[PDB]
Design a binder for this molecule. Structure first.
Ligand SMILES: CCCCCCCCCCCCCCCCCC(=O)OC[C@H](COP(=O)([O-])OCC(O)COP(=O)([O-])OC[C@@H](COC(=O)CCCCCCCCCCCCCCCCC)OC(=O)CCCCCCCCCCCCCCCCC)OC(=O)CCCCCCCCCCCCCCCCC
Ligand SMILES: CCCCCCCCCCCCCCCCCC(=O)OC[C@H](COP(=O)([O-])OCC(O)COP(=O)([O-])OC[C@@H](COC(=O)CCCCCCCCCCCCCCCCC)OC(=O)CCCCCCCCCCCCCCCCC)OC(=O)CCCCCCCCCCCCCCCCC
Ligand SMILES: CCCCCCCCCCCCCCCCCC(=O)OC[C@H](COP(=O)([O-])OCC[N+](C)(C)C)OC(=O)CCCCCCCCCCCCCCCCC
Ligand SMILES: CCCCCCCCCCCCCCCCCC(=O)OC[C@H](COP(=O)(O)OCCN)OC(=O)CCCCCCCCCCCCCCCCC
Ligand SMILES: CCCCCCCCCCCCCCCCCC(=O)OC[C@H](COP(=O)(O)OCCN)OC(=O)CCCCCCCCCCCCCCCCC
Ligand SMILES: CCCCCCCCCCCCCCCCCC(=O)OC[C@H](COP(=O)(O)OCCN)OC(=O)CCCCCCCCCCCCCCCCC
Ligand SMILES: CCCCCCCCCCCCCCCCCC(=O)OC[C@H](COP(=O)(O)OCCN)OC(=O)CCCCCCCCCCCCCCCCC
Ligand code: HEC
Ligand code: HEM
Ligand code: HEM
Ligand SMILES: COc1c(O)c(C)c(C/C=C(\C)CC/C=C(\C)CC/C=C(/C)CC/C=C(\C)CC/C=C(\C)CCC=C(C)C)c(O)c1OC
Lengths: 68, 49, 373, 54, 240, 98, 140, 76, 48
């Protein structure tokens, strides 16, 4: 019986919002870009940091109500 | 300073100059000796060593 | 009675101006803060050990095992911060109201300011955290800038090739001994002020309206002491670490440098200036001048009015000076990268040009407007 | 609240706002030069309104 | 530097007059004892501290007598070991820094006694780091013994995910989800870095109350003794 | 320039305390010599005006607008007496210089 | 020289206040010039200088209302964290109303100004949010 | 000390006993107007330097961020 | 009214001190008790 980590359920519920899906779209393009260009040193951290910043901001808005 | 640009003021200084130099000299000797400044002490004819 | 005579002349009946605002409380607060620091420092000294193996352990033992030892330690740290807040507001009162024309009092003041900054620097070195060790090396290195005798002086102070136990122990001794010299210099400070009496915010001769001090400016100092204690205890009991550096809670690792090294909030303005000047020596000098420019201040007064209550252009220049002092405090915090650097360079240029050039020219213009010049 | 505050705010203020606006717009010298120059200003602004929104 | 800045979480120990949840400190101590003690040290925390926090004297001793400690010199002069005592500090997971370095692939697990105080925005950081082992994105590659934790400086922490859901079972039975475990250990580490958090806040309430009484009054006494002057009505009546 | 000087006179704010311009001068040695040479009535009005301004600054009040000091009305009484002090002062200085 | 003003809208509100305030200040100032011009062309002055002064007064006053509007709205948005909220603008519009009031030395005008101007600015925000079209092309 | 501080003449000075007068006469009655009176005589000299400090601080922050932000065109 | 008080415990300085000291002796009891009630209740369920 998988013990649901409320954090996971809150995480995809927060990824359903709009700033997270826009940053994920840049993340995808960014990662595709890095993937497409076989030899390059352009990482996706900035995009990824922006997506994680927005997502964990709205996660930390409402995470602790589900924790005993 | 207006008052200090004066004729007697200048005379006074000229008369005071020698004494001033003497005082700097005393301090100079002291510095050399006290701090053992060796750049200057090393040239001294006798105390060298 | 020859011991009570002093108090009667000085604390009980001294003729004080009737119209001095709450800013004149601040110096008395500084004296109270000094005692508070000394008292808390004494109760830190009964358990602190100035050994590099045991200094961090002794500080943690104070915070964890001594009864209310965390209270005395954080009272000491936030009282140093309160000391610098009251010191900056005292200096700002002296600059705004033309109190620097009491030249001997002003010079004993800037000597006290230098002594307090040195005491706080060595005290911050004392807990032997990561931040203390890298901070010490940094400023001790500042001395190396000296053109010829720099290296020796640095090594002397360090007491060895690099800061190590040799430093910590002598920094404990010097940090212990300097607040008593500060107390003696404060007696000379109040002494040179007793010979003149205080100034008033209008800047005029207040000899026609003076009142006693016991019932009028004593209860006022008691109220200011109570408000300062309220701010100090809400700094200690509610936001204790808000005025600290988290990296000081790690032990001193000579091998690694905490990346976000920065001087405490009060040294920042100076830090900015130092960083601004490209030349190392230049920075050190400018830094010193930053504090010393104040001493130089009584020779720059070119106005026929003592205070800035009736001087609006110099009021505007004064608040621009407070503004870019706050800017220099912010820049120090910011890391080395565009455009923080340029602001720092300008802010320092504007600071020195407002104090050196703009205020006497503005005072000449203000005297011309009143048909005095 | 009745009478003064609810009559000075909604009913009276709107009375004043306009009254004052008519006073400035209708206080005209009657001289032709002034009036005409205003035609000049207009041509200029309209020239621009077209220009910037080209 | 360029680093993800952990968000603000609605903790309970943040309330101006709010104390730490002590059941969470007990659970986080269990988390440290079963997971974090293998590599991290707690040199300035000893069992006695717990007494009066989340454990009783007898219980604490239970805890103490559940570990082994060296005991100075034998009468023979031969160092020996003894049942842990309420006066014993928490055991070293590595006799010397080198040991830890070696075992932890060159990484020195920092003493988690003051980690929360030593890390900027510690409580958050801790939670974030322990719960921030996300996959490295394209363009970044980490060597062995490294992990892409956005929050960790350099996003390359030697520690591996130290909390897998249901890593340990809470004696209280509260579901041991990774998060419930990270929140408990962040509360505990917080407590560790400031065992007096609760006691202090009490004084704070008291101080405010006192100032709230004394401050207003001192003002009335000052305004009494200053009313005299503040009502002075000067007047110049030259001989004329 | 005259209107801008009146605006600066209002912005300086010593007229709101009932002060004159010469009341606001910093008492240096020359200013105290000029004050000592004042007649008794002018000195008494100056001391009363300074005391009233100090009392108003104590209570953080100003005078009513009808009681302020009109720029046009302000009288530069100490000025005449001051010039002399400066003149005499300079003469003496020059003598010593030479 | 128009790609500029538009920029105000492009970046999300509450962000890059510097630009916002600069742009808003210019628009007000531009209006100031135009307004002074009509004010000088008609109801002329007495001396060239007197009129130059007017122009300045009107220009500055208008530039000010421009700035505070820009500053208040941007800051409110940032502080209130509501990137897109009509109220933010209202706070700003009110601010402009007050400024204007001060420059005219009248509390009452500030009252008139706070509500009317603010309401107007708020409506601008709504307008942008709801994609209201002003001066529309004939599409019948 | 007192007695030798200054020379004034014909300046009468009336006063009242502390217990005879209200402690906070019209404290909020005129206090508010006065505090407001005060703020309007000093706000134009004090506030605009701190306003442009706020603008420079924000600007610096933003500018710094943009400085840090990555230019995609850079890599090509 | 206070008058009765004043004439009895607040007019003679010695008595003034007496009332102060005695009051302070009890105030601590009351303050601590009242204050604790407030703090504990705020954090009820978290203590111990
Ligand atoms: C605003 C609403 C209330 C109002 O209108 O009050 C009018 C009143 C002013 O009335 P006023 O008749 O125009 O002025 C005469 C003063 O009341 C005469 O009193 P004062 O203001 O000269 O009092 C001396 C001064 C003494 O202040 C100090 O000693 C302050 C010391 C420095 C600050 C603390 C140090 C640390 C700073 C860190 C930064 O105290 C204050 O400034 C206020 C003390 C408040 C105590 C707590 C009251 C609750 O406003 C205040 O007193 C402001 C503070 C209270 C609100
Ligand atoms: C191609 C298409 C081209 C279309 C061109 C449209 C141009 C419209 C402008 C006016 C045209 C010529 C005209 O008849 O104006 C005479 C008018 C005569 O005024 P005046 O003889 O100088 O005033 C006599 C005293 O000096 C008055 O004493 P005062 O000056 O002391 O009173 C004003 C005082 C106190 O002010 C107040 O209490 C009231 C403030 C009202 C502000 C809003 C006024 C405009 C409202 C438009 C809606 O504040 C000031 O002193 C000035 C402070 C700085 C204010 C800067 C405002 C710039 C507004 C620019 C508006 C541009 C058009 C929109 O000249 C102007 O002032 C022009 C601007 C305002 C015109 C009056 C309002 C007409 C609005 C009709 C609708 C326009 C918008 C919708 C379309
Ligand atoms: C903090 C309070 C600072 C008060 C400063 C001041 O003006 O003096 C208060 C006042 C000033 O005088 P007062 O006139 O305000 O009040 C005096 C009251 N009678 C007339 C009865 C003396 O002095 C005192 O109240 C002295 C009180 C002595 C109490 C000694 C025992 C204390 C026991 C504590 C337990
Ligand atoms: C902060 C704003 C404080 C303030 O209220 O500013 C206006 C005030 C007006 O003072 P004034 O015009 O003399 O009138 C007072 C009696 N009505 O002007 C003043 O309050 C003057 C206060 C003088 C001290 C101000 C100190 C501010 C901080 C300065 C820090 C740096 C000091 C220099 C360091 C080098
Ligand atoms: C021309 C004035 C017009 C005023 C119109 C307002 C109405 C006036 C009539 C009604 C009365 C209202 C209330 C009056 C209060 C007191 C009087 C007053 O405010 O006067 C105006 C005041 C003083 O005027 P004055 O000093 O003569 O002007 C010289 C300007 N330098 O001047 C001011 O307050 C102006 C202050 C401007 C300050 C600008 C500072 C800009 C630069 C700041 C830099 C800060 C640091 C930047 C970073 C540096 C490092 C990178
Ligand atoms: C939400 C509720 C909003 C309610 C708005 C109510 C507007 C009308 C209120 C009353 C206005 C009024 O009475 O105007 C009279 C005023 C003075 O002129 P009058 O009274 O004709 O002559 C003086 C006496 N013989 O004449 C004036 O000053 C102008 C009158 C304007 C009339 C209203 C215009 C509204 C325009 C909206 C755009
Ligand atoms: C609901 C609406 C409530 C509006 C506020 C109600 C109360 C208004 C008030 O009490 O003041 C009326 C105002 C008083 O002003 P007063 O002291 O006479 O000084 C005038 C100096 N010119 O009356 C006046 O004399 C001044 C009138 C000023 C009118 C213009 C104010 C700005 C209008 C901006 C409109 C929108 C512009 C952008 C679109
Ligand atoms: C119990 C769930 C915990 C918690 C709360 C933390 N850890 Fe560890 N840790 C380990 C090692 C080798 C390191 C150093 C790695 C490196 O420096 O590259 C760490 C580090 C930490 C930190 C400090 C982070 C920082 O910025 O310095 C923190 C806050 C932290 N950990 C929390 C090793 C281990 C373990 C052995 C595999 C396990 C178990 C834990 N850690 C458990 C925990
Ligand atoms: C003679 C009286 C004093 C004594 C005996 C004393 C003693 C001590 C001791 C033992 C410490 C180390 C404990 C600690 O980490 O807090 C310390 C720290 C410190 N002291 Fe003092 N001190 C005295 C006065 C002062 C004064 C006057 C100042 C202010 C200028 C000051 C500023 C500091 C600071 C800033 C620290 C560092 C606090 C920290 O760890 O954050 N001390 N002092
Ligand atoms: C060590 C910290 C200091 C202490 C304890 C201290 C103490 C005091 C005290 C008690 C007073 C008299 C009360 C008052 O007017 O506020 C005073 C006044 C004064 N101090 Fe200081 N002071 C300190 C720092 C300084 C500094 C650094 C300066 C110089 C910038 C300075 C310059 C003055 C001046 C000029 C006055 C006269 C106030 C006036 O009449 O306007 N003080 N100080
Ligand atoms: C009326 O003029 C005076 C005055 O006469 C005195 C003595 C003081 C001194 C007041 C204090 C209580 C400050 C204490 C000063 C010290 C000497 C600090 C030394 C500290 C000790 C450890 C003792 C003033 O502040 C003051 O102006 C308000």
């Amino acid at each position: 019986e998988e013990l649901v980590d409320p954090l996971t359920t809150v995480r995809e519920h927060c990824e359903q919002l709009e700033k997270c899906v826009k940053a994920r779209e840049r993340l995808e393009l960014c990662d595709n870009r890095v993937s497409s260009r076989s030899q390059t040193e352009e990482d996706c951290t900035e995009e990824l940091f922006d997506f994680l910043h927005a997502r964990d901001h709205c996660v930390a808005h409402k995470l602790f109500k589900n924790l005993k | 300073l207006s008052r200090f640009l004066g004729p007697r003021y200048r005379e006074l200084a000229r008369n005071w100059i020698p004494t001033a130099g003497m005082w700097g000299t005393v301090g100079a000797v002291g510095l050399v000796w006290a701090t053992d400044w060796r750049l200057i002490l090393d040239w001294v004819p006798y105390i060298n060593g | 009675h020859p011991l009570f005579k002093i108090i009667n002349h000085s604390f009980i009946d001294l003729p004080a101006p009737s119209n001095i605002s709450s800013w004149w409380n601040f110096g008395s607060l500084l004296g109270v803060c000094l005692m508070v620091q000394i008292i808390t420092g004494l109760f830190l000294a009964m358990h602190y050990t100035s050994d590099t193996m045991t200094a961090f352990s002794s500080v943690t033992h104070i915070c964890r095992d001594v009864n209310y030892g965390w209270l005395i330690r954080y009272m000491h740290a936030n009282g140093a911060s309160m000391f610098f807040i009251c010191l900056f507001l005292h200096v700002g009162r002296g600059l705004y109201y033309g109190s620097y024309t009491f030249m001997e009092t002003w010079n004993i003041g800037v000597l006290l300011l230098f002594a307090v900054m040195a005491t706080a620097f060595m005290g911050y070195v004392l807990p032997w955290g990561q931040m203390s060790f890298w901070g010490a090396t940094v400023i001790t290195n500042l001395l190396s800038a000296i053109p010829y005798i720099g290296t020796t002086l640095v090594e002397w102070i360090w007491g060895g090739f690099s800061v190590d136990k040799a430093t910590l122990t002598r920094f404990f001794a010097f940090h212990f001994i300097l607040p008593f010299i500060i107390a003696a210099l404060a007696i000379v400070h109040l002494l040179f002020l007793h010979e003149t009496g205080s100034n008033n915010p209008t800047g005029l001769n207040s000899d026609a309206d003076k009142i006693p001090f016991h019932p009028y400016y004593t209860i006022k100092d008691i109220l200011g002491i109570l408000i300062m204690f309220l701010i100090l205890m809400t700094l200690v009991l509610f936001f204790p670490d808000m005025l600290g550096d988290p990296d000081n809670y790690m032990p001193a690792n000579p091998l690694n440098t905490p990346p976000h090294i920065k001087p405490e909030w009060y040294f920042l303005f100076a830090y900015a200036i130092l960083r601004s000047i490209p030349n190392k020596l230049g920075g050190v000098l400018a830094l010193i001048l930053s504090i010393l420019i104040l001493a130089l201040m009584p020779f720059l007064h070119t106005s026929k009015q003592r205070s800035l209550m009736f001087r609006p252009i110099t009021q505007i220049l004064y608040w621009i000076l407070v503004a870019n002092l706050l800017i220099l405090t912010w820049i120090g915090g910011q890391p080395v990268e565009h455009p923080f650097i340029i602001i720092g360079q300008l802010a320092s240029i504007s600071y020195f040009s407002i104090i050196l050039i703009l205020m006497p020219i503005s005072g000449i213009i203000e005297d011309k407007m009143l048909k005095l010049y | 609240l009745d009478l003064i505050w609810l009559e000075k705010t909604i009913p009276k203020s709107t009375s004043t706002l306009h009254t004052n606006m008519t006073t400035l717009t209708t206080n005209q010298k009657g001289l032709i030069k002034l009036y005409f120059m205003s035609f000049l200003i207009n041509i200029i602004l309209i020239i621009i309104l077209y220009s910037i929104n080209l | 530097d360029l680093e993800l800045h952990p968000p603000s979480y609605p903790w309970s120990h943040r309330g101006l007059l709010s104390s730490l949840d002590h059941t969470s400190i007990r659970r986080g101590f269990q988390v440290y004892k079963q997971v974090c003690s293998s590599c991290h040290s707690m040199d300035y925390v000893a069992y006695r501290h717990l007494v009066g926090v989340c454990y009783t004297e007898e219980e604490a001793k239970a805890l103490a007598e559940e570990v082994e400690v060296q005991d100075g010199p034998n009468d023979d002069g031969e160092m020996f070991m003894r049942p842990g005592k309420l006066s014993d500090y928490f055991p070293k997971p590595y006799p010397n820094p080198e040991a830890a370095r070696a075992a932890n692939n060159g990484a020195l697990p920092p003493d988690l006694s003051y980690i929360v105080r030593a890390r900027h925005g510690g409580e958050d950081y801790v939670f974030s780091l322990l719960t921030g082992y996300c996959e490295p994105p394209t363009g970044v590659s980490l060597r062995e013994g490294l992990y892409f934790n956005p929050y960790f400086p350099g996003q390359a922490i030697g520690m591996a995910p130290p909390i897998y859901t249901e890593v340990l079972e809470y004696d209280d039975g509260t579901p041991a989800t990774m998060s419930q475990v990270a929140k408990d250990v962040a509360t505990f580490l917080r407590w560790a870095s400031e065992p007096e958090h609760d006691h202090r806040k009490r004084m704070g309430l008291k101080m405010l109350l006192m100032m709230g009484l004394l401050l207003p009054l001192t003002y009335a006494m000052k305004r009494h003794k200053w009313s005299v002057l503040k009502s002075r009505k000067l007047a110049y009546r030259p001989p004329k | 320039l005259d209107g801008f000087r009146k605006w600066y006179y209002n912005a300086a704010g010593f007229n709101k305390l009932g002060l004159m311009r010469d009341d606001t001068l910093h008492e240096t040695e020359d200013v105290k010599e000029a004050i000592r040479r004042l007649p008794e009535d002018l000195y008494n009005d100056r001391m009363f005006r300074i005391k009233r301004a100090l009392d108003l600054t104590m209570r953080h009040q100003i005078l009513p607008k009808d009681q302020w000091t009109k720029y046009e009305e302000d009288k530069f009484y100490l000025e005449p007496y001051l010039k002399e002090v400066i003149r005499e002062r300079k003469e003496r200085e020059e003598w010593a210089k030479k | 020289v128009k790609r500029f003003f538009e920029s105000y809208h492009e970046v999300p509100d509450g962000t890059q206040c510097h630009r916002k305030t600069y742009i808003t200040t210019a628009l007000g100032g531009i209006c100031g010039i135009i307004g002074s011009a009509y004010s000088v062309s008609l109801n002329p002055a007495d001396s060239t200088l007197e009129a130059v002064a007017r122009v300045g007064r009107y220009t500055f006053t208008a530039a000010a209302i421009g700035a505070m509007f820009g500053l208040t709205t941007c800051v409110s948005a940032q502080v209130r964290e509501k990137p897109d909220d009509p109220l933010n603008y209202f706070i700003g519009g009110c601010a402009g109303g007050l400024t204007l009031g001060a420059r005219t030395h009248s509390y009452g005008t500030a009252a008139m100004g706070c509500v009317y101007m603010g309401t107007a600015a708020a409506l601008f925000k709504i307008g942008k949010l709801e994609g209201w079209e002003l001066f529309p092309t004939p599409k019948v | 000390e007192f007695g030798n501080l200054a020379r004034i003449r014909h300046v009468i000075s009336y006063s009242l006993s502390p217990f005879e007068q209200r402690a906070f006469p019209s404290y909020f009655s005129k206090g508010i107007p006065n505090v407001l009176r005060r703020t309007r005589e000093r706000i134009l000299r004090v506030a605009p330097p701190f306003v442009v400090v706020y603008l420079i601080y924000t600007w610096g922050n933003q500018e710094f961020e943009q400085s840090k932000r990555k230019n995609p065109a850079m890599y090509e | 009214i206070p008058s009765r008080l004043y004439s009895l415990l607040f007019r003679r300085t010695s008595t003034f001190a007496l009332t102060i000291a005695v009051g302070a002796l009890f105030f601590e009891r009351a303050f601590d008790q009242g204050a604790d009630a407030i703090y504990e209740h705020i954090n009820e369920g978290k203590l111990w």
